[PDB]
Design a protein around this ligand. Structure first.
Ligand SMILES: [Cu+2]
Ligand SMILES: [Cu+2]
Ligand SMILES: [Cu+2]
Ligand SMILES: [Cu+2]
Ligand SMILES: [Cu+2]
Ligand SMILES: [Cu+2]
Lengths: 336, 335, 336
């Protein structure tokens, strides 16, 4: 497609929503290829990542950790306006794993405080894909400070299973998983810093242990629990997109399954089925499709259970509806 | 319907200790059945290495791992779980094969002196982890040995990707356990009077994400020496492998995984000709192999530090005739 | 085949080349089955693995870490002459994951200094496969000292995608990824030793933490950057073989993709497609096929970014050609 051809394509401006929600889209593409426009301001901000009050200086695309999910269709163009406000102290950029060239866009989007840039790429491959910050020489520090999210490049025809049957979800959630490396004092208590750069040396030491102090969903321990639990109903079809930009994870729906799981995240790779626990390598996104059959509380976890229940990587689903005794029943309740 | 489920046959099955598996048929015998199992949970001090290191283990049916239960797709598994009054802790069970109530965990919380009976329909074919999961103390029970697996065979037995039958002559269940044993200032592993005394010290070790031991069948060397698994040349063997908490990467040294259901799910077509497969923590996998050479094999987690320094190494002793076409020493070690 | 049948097959002596290059070979088999002869001399040598002058006592098959890629076709015989020179101090051997019996050949190739052996095995299974040293009682030590490489057993008809279309590479590269465990003194400086055995006790202690001090490609930090950057051009099809004999890795071509990825490394298992980041478990090799579409510098990494950019696991590709503005364009360059 020539420059003139692309200029004639229709533009749609998308308003992003905060994870774990996803902006309005259609599963099946409406019309021909479009240039889909997004804007994100990068915020360097203090975030609290557990109930004790532990804080991190985060790099937060659109002001959240993870950054928001951008959704386009195959052969659309994604056109991102990225802004680094003058209140920030560091240079930032963006690497789209969905994109082709210039280190995923990273080499073309280095913006100092008070600068902006507009990057356009053709989303040639269908799937979910990580994006993250990657300033040369400081790449892992920015990513494990929360500077990451994902996009979904839907097939123009929507999702299908491995054999041509249409899969249509009723709702979608995006779970970004973040490994944090928080320095401690000699008493074992987490340290606080005045500016991001003050934490650098101490944080690099922790990073080198390859052992996160915290592993969280949506930026904090318990962020997707309580009144922030994800919800569904018996019979409802849900797609769960999960990303990890730096470190392996193994998602599991406690009480459910992944009926179809694109564990590599790429829709031209047929999904695994009937999954108990799937595996997403660091630097990737995956997606899992499930139809709820039972009501009640579910936990969605990284099934290294230490990571889930000691380090923070557990969310809840609240599910409404009628219990199915054929699928499961307590023949004898706990009794003497 | 309600009448139809109640009229299905009930069948009690006697369990056996890993790595062996109780009696079953690969192709389902009859229509759907309710397969009944009973397991008593034993809290017991087990020795896990050659230095006398102890762990207060949670042992479904008296073993780490708990035994393999085997049913067919659309059978019901009906487990009676018993927690004797001599135990100190509440326990329960989460079947990854099951649907609802946190895998059954929500319905099976039994204090010492209690029992429960859980039924679920095995709707999905594959091998699946089960483990204890008391709310608020889930990892502690699991890394204390409270885990095993089940196999839900397709009603028509196993098949390859093109649909030809795969029929094993024997089956072994290897449960892999990451343990996190506290050490004192001098580097000696600590011992405790009761399970709860170890809790605080153990969680500290757990948070390093670095096991002190990684073992098969509950201890370093449990499946080596005189306890090696066996086969013969020409024999087809299915090896079911589970890890309820932590990744592993099985490898049969001297062999391969001819077909590997690496995700453990039989509606997902098996990978083939595998050197080393990968099972994420929280899952089981299964590998089918036909032995072609006699001799000693090692079956390991192929992080070789985990295998040979931390304990995740088993043996197969295989009888039969050596095949010089497949391998031959042209010139033996010589100066 | 009988012993007589094998004796009658053509012999072909191959001359090995150092990683990341691969010796001359045909993708499609030239003729019927042959016995492909290789020779390698094991060298115990010091290698410097970072810019702080950190040393490892390496076990180098053919003088390199990793050892070289050996290439045959399915149902050929690989015949290795392995030589342990008198100048070495330790017994060594070799286990081919591609082979069947005697612990991959390890039980038949145990050679003290001043000894040699010849092993022949039938390459019955197509794929990329680890090989490594494994002296009973000292296995992990030899492997994490650099005693590993890989082979490729091509299908006789070359590579194909999942539907039987031919996949033919113009270039091939072999990246061996190595986890090292280097002891430190009490002030954090890496220790040096005058003999391999002198470092055993100290090294075993570090190995037991399951935390490498270094994770590198081709034996050292930056080994595959600068004078040793891999090269390609726009339009060229490139196969990247990647091995890790002891520890998981998650390769990613920054700016690119794995168009087809045999993540398990086995060619009768259909490849994944459109991959961002693939996964190779410790003890295995994998392979990725990609057609370059953009020029410039790509980084090729283990996408645990701490492992890539703090511990050493990053390579570069230098790619010539014309930039493609359809696939990617800077609409607005970084600016106030
Ligand atoms: Cu940044
Ligand atoms: Cu990346
Ligand atoms: Cu328990
Ligand atoms: Cu579980
Ligand atoms: Cu060696
Ligand atoms: Cu090996």
């Amino acid at each position: 497609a020539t420059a003139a051809e692309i200029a004639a394509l229709p533009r749609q401006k998308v308003e992003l929503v905060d994870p774990p929600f996803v902006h309005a889209h259609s599963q099946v593409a409406e019309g021909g290829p479009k240039v889909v426009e997004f804007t994100m301001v990068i915020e360097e901000k203090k975030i609290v990542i557990d109930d004790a009050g532990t804080e991190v200086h985060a790099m937060a695309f659109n002001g959240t950790v993870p950054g928001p999910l951008m959704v386009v269709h195959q052969d659309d163009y994604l056109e991102l306006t990225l802004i680094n406000p003058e209140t920030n102290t560091l240079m930032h950029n963006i690497d789209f794993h969905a994109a082709t060239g210039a280190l995923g866009g990273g080499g073309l989007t280095e913006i100092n405080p008070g600068e902006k840039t507009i990057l356009r790429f053709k989303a040639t491959k269908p799937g979910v894909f990580v994006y993250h910050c990657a300033p040369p020489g400081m790449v892992p520090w920015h990513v494990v400070s929360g500077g990451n999210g994902a996009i979904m490049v839907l097939p123009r025809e929507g999702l299908h299973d491995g054999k041509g049957k249409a899969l249509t979800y009723d709702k979608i959630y995006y779970v970004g998983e973040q490994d944090f490396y928080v320095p401690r004092d000699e008493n074992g208590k987490y340290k606080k810093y005045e500016a991001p750069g003050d934490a650098y040396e101490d944080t690099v030491k922790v990073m080198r242990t390859l052992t996160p102090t915290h592993v969280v969903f949506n930026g904090a321990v318990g962020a997707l629990t309580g009144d922030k639990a994800m919800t569904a109903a018996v019979g409802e079809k849900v797609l769960i997109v999960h990303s990890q930009a730096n470190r392996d994870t193994r998602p599991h729906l406690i009480g459910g399954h992944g009926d179809y799981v694109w564990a590599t995240g790429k829709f031209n790779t047929p999904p695994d089925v009937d999954q108990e626990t799937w595996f997403i390598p660091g630097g990737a996104a995956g997606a899992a499709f499930y139809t709820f059959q039972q009501p009640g509380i579910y936990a969605y976890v990284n099934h290294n259970l230490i990571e889930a229940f000691e380090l923070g990587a557990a969310a809840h689903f609240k599910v409404t509806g009628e219990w199915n005794d054929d699928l499961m029943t307590s023949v004898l309740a706990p009794s003497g």
